[PDB]
Ligand binder design. Sequence first.
Ligand SMILES: CCOc1ccc(C(C)=O)cc1NC(=O)c1cc(NC(=O)c2ccc(CN3CCN(C)CC3)o2)cc(-c2ccn(C)n2)c1
Length: 116
Amino acid sequence: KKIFKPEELRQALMPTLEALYRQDPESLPFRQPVDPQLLGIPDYFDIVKNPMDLSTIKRKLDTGQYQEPWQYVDDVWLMFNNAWLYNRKTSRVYKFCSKLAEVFEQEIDPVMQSLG
Ligand SMILES: CCOc1ccc(C(C)=O)cc1NC(=O)c1cc(NC(=O)c2ccc(CN3CCN(C)CC3)o2)cc(-c2ccn(C)n2)c1
């Protein structure tokens, strides 16, 4: 029954999202929604039914869509899980995803401990 105001969540969590944006080159596939037609992967939405990317998560943070820290974390991991699902383990995007997940863990673990 602990209440998290949107400003407090945003202040605590936005640095962890910024760390993902900063990661170069590995965030490049993740900074915008997947465009299946433009990227040449027209079957994408046949596999990924709940797309998620950094810019969608940022907008939800900026508009107070997350009431709890774990709701933000779940969207970050939805982005990772989509990329590990759609892309082969031998592929650029799967490998970039794996790196982003390691970066996110380093950032989010201390923020969680201090948020409760
Ligand atoms: C083909 C299939 O793709 C995909 C399949 C599946 C997925 C998902 C999420 O399941 C995602 C994708 N997406 C990508 O793989 C992708 C990859 C890049 N760039 C790189 O990986 C990269 C490494 C080094 C350089 C050189 N770079 C640097 C910057 N410099 C201005 C230019 C040269 O680029 C970029 C983009 C992208 C989309 C919009 N934008 C503005 N950028 C998308």
